[PDB]
Design a protein around this ligand. Structure first.
Ligand SMILES: CC(=O)c1ccc2c(c1)/C(=C(/NC1CCN(C)CC1)c1ccccc1)C(=O)N2
Length: 349
């Protein structure tokens, strides 16, 4: 076996690097970011992920600066960070030692779809609540993920703990400062972004989460668009044609898509029979045309659909106890503090 010893700066605490050794490196991910590895530590024998990205002198890494401000159980923790040379030494890379999680929400949802089965509502409740909890934390700093999809939602099959990953698209949204329109994966792309909105709030992650929720309820994406324009046709097929005021509320740059008035399709008819009415009520308040009309991540966590997790007698289908879901902080509750009366039940008080 080959051992790799490097001096890496820890993500949290003071900027003081330490000698970190790792072995058994293998390629597990490949994307727009760069490359993701899986390595075993020499100290505890713990498995960690190493995301190698090509870095320049012109500026500092945007993802790294967002990552070392973040400390939450439902987001992959930045263990360490170091610099390596792999292009005749003239070009340098940024390696991010992050948490390793075996499965993803996509892979778990795929298992049921291939077996013609439905994902149990308890799993839909646990995965969605943890996504909105991590969203309430990132949005309190002004940071918007801009890439919410089941492939980026990591999963541990035994404990059922969800973790958010890939903060490359992520940016601290500021009022007045424009942003790029073509962002997020097509099936989870908000209608503002299709309408060419450069000025948007962190409510685009709320829409993307709503797209994931409906996907876990249907067993397939709700809006499978063939093109960038065919994506809006998929949305119009269930939500109907947006009103004059709904269009303006998205703040659209260069509009006039020229589509016929088809009108909204009932939410109950969209999903399978005997689908919990609370899931539909939640999905209706997340997948809204008007971004300001959408439920906030904390408001989504306080919804009637996640009341089963708030029960003191709730447990995982494998017998194990549900993870920490009520250990909220002042930074998490920052947007709406009186919501703590619903979010934190008397048993956990
Ligand atoms: C993208 C990023 O920033 C990041 C950060 C930390 C991470 C991962 C990704 C990650 C991934 N793990 C997969 C390993 C293979 N199994 C079968 C599925 C899960 C992974 C890799 C590529 C795409 C999506 C997810 C993990 O375990 N820890």
């Amino acid at each position: 076996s080959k051992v790799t010893t490097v001096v890496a700066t820890p993500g949290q605490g003071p900027d003081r690097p330490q000698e970190v050794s790792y072995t058994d490196t293998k390629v597990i991910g490949n994307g727009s970011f760069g490359v993701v590895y899986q390595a075993k530590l020499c100290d505890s024998g713990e498995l960690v992920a190493i995301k190698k990205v090509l870095q320049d002198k012109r500026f500092k890494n945007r993802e790294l600066q967002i990552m070392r401000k973040l400390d939450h159980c439902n987001i992959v923790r930045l263990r360490y960070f170091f610099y390596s040379s792999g292009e005749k030494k003239d070009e340098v890379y940024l390696n991010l030692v992050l948490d390793y999680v075996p499965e993803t929400v996509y892979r778990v949802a795929r298992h049921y779809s291939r077996a013609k089965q439905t994902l149990p509502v308890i799993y839909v409740k646990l995965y969605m609540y943890q996504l909105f909890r991590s969203l309430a934390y990132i949005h309190s700093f002004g940071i918007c993920h801009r890439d919410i999809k089941p492939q980026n939602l990591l999963l541990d099959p035994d404990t059922a703990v969800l973790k958010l990953c890939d903060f490359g698209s992520a940016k601290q949204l500021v009022r007045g400062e424009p942003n790029v329109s073509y962002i997020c994966s097509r099936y989870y792309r908000a209608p503002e972004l299709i309408f060419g909105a450069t000025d948007y709030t962190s409510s685009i992650d709320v829409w993307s989460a709503g797209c994931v929720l409906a996907e876990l309820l249907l067993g397939q994406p709700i809006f499978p668009g063939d093109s960038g324009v065919d994506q809006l046709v998929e949305i119009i097929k269930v939500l109907g044609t947006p009103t004059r005021e709904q269009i303006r509320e998205m703040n659209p740059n260069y509009t006039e898509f020229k589509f016929p008035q088809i009108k909204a399709h009932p939410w109950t008819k969209v999903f399978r029979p005997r689908t919990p009415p609370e899931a539909i009520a939640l999905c209706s308040r997340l997948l809204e045309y008007t971004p300001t009309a959408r439920l906030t991540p904390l408001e989504a966590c306080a919804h009637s659909f996640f009341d089963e997790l708030r029960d003191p007698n709730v447990k995982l289908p494998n017998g194990r106890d549900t993870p920490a879901l009520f250990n909220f902080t002042t930074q998490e509750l920052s947007s709406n503090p009186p919501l703590a009366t619903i979010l934190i039940p008397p048993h956990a008080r």
